[PDB]
Each structure stands twice: as C-alpha cells, then as structure tokens.
Design a protein around this ligand. Structure first.
Ligand code: 703
Lengths: 142, 140
C-alpha cells in the first residue's frame, strides 16, 4: 500500500502522497506521484499531534480545572497542552483520564518514606508502633 | 513566523529558498527535494533500523541492543518508527541509574512485614514492618 508515510489519494487509489507533518493540515492532496501535499500549518490555537492527513487541526483543550489543575506547557501546533500538577500537590489519576491534584500530605506523624511525587502522595510508615494507615498514623482499633 | 521554511519543511542545502517536507519517521532522505512542489524522496528504513520522527536525515539510526548488563529484556521489537524498547523481567523494579543507565533490582517478597504497595515496572514493593520501629533511613 502507500509505504511509510504516504497515504492513499482519495481521488485515485494509485497515487500515494506524503502524510502531513505535526502541526500542519492537509490543504490539499498531492496531484499525482512525485508531487508535494499541501500542508499548511495550524492556525493557533490548535495542533495536530502526529503524521496525519487531517482536514483540520484539533483545537486546544484547556485543563479540567475543576480538578485543581494547571497546565504547564502550552498548546502549540504539535503539542496539545500538558496539564500537570500545581506547585507540589499530587497527580491523582482518578480514573484516568480524568485526574486531580490532591494536596501533598505530609505524614500524620510517622516517619517519611517516599517523598511526595507526581504519581504518588508522600508515603508513610509510622512513629511509636502506631497502626499504619496510608498517611495517618492511627494507634489501633483505637 | 519568526521561522525560516515553515512547519514541516527543511531548507535545501542548495537553493536556499527551496524548502522541502521532512522525511517521516520510518524513513530517510533518499535524495533532497527538486523544487517546491514535488515531495522529498524518502525511502523506508532498512530492517533493524529506525529513525526519530521529523528527519531530514541521511541515514537511519541502527536499532538498539538491550543491556543484559542490567537485567533487561527487549520488551518490544525495534521497528522503523520506534526503537527496541527494553525493561526488567516480571517483576523486578527498574532503577534509573541516571535516566539512561538503569538497573534491574528485584521486587521485595514483602520485606520486613506485609505488602503495602504492590511492586511494578517503575518501583519496588513497599511494605510495612510487623514490628513497628519507625523508618530509620531504610530498615525498620
Ligand atoms: C531518530 C533520529 C535521530 C538523530 C540522528 C542524529 C541526531 C543528531 C545527530 N545525529 C547524527 S547521525 N549526527 C551526525 C554527526 C554529524 N557531525 C559530523 C562531524 O562534524 C560535525 C557534525 C548528529 O549530530 S538525531 C535520533 C533519534 N533519537 O531519538 O535520538 C531518533
């Protein structure tokens, strides 16, 4: 079929044009072998992520800010925005692909194991033989 | 805009206002492009070879070899538009000794107590001591 990186001409299923590039749409399909495809760039704010032959770019998506989000590199012809987590809170994907930043919990009096990190909250184990509970250090059933 | 050629094109080595589309990933520069309305010529990459992405690039890069010098296996084929990817066998956890060097290290059969965090591709198990001391550094 069209080898790597070429697609099938709709009009004539015997001609294979280059696929566009990230960032650009197809303004029109290349006229016959040998010929370039008209890839005109994305009107900001929009993108396409990849090889494609798309008649339009996909708009920028803003962050689902209900989840205490902030994006942290902007949407820009290849890149849809990346949102990620606000000044050292943590990225709880629930379920992906929504997620929220909960706040980073410092331990509820235990000894720090893992420090707070983009996939996981700080991780605790505890002071003075308390019964261990995620963050919390709760003595026992009480 | 602030640019030279636009998005998707390189400038010709020669006519410094020919621009040409870039070779796709999977494919190299067979020869640069004649003039502004014919495609650049891109041939597939040879087997056991691949290339980034947007290349105006003379050669493919050769595949990669997984380092058994750190407990790896190719977890997926190297094929033209993606490298050989490797990893640790199921399940060791993987330790990026500098993001680029990385090791295979085993999961813990729950050491010191019982299983908290199951262990996986990135990271080890985390357990908790059935004998509550209080993490001095790394023991109980
Ligand atoms: C896909 C494609 C690539 C790339 C290949 C190269 C990159 C940077 C350089 N290469 C090569 S092959 N190369 C040759 C050095 C040229 N010099 C000769 C002596 O005089 C000075 C110039 C580079 O400089 S990127 C890479 C990847 N990848 O993801 O790394 C994938």
């Amino acid at each position: 079929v069209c080898p790597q990186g070429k697609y099938i001409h709709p009009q004539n299923n015997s001609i294979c044009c280059t696929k566009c590039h990230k960032g650009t749409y197809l303004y029109n399909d290349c006229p016959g072998p040998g010929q370039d495809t008209d890839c005109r760039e994305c009107e900001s704010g929009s993108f396409t992520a990849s090889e494609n032959h798309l008649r339009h770019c996909l708009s920028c998506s803003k962050c689902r800010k209900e989840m205490g989000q902030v994006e942290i590199s902007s949407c820009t012809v290849d890149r849809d925005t990346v949102c990620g987590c606000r000044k050292n809170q943590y990225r709880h994907y629930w379920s992906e692909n929504l997620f929220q930043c909960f706040n980073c919990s410092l331990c509820l009096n235990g000894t720090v194991h893992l420090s707070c990190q983009e996939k996981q909250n700080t991780v605790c184990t505890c002071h003075a033989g308390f019964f261990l509970r995620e963050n919390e250090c709760v003595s026992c059933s009480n």
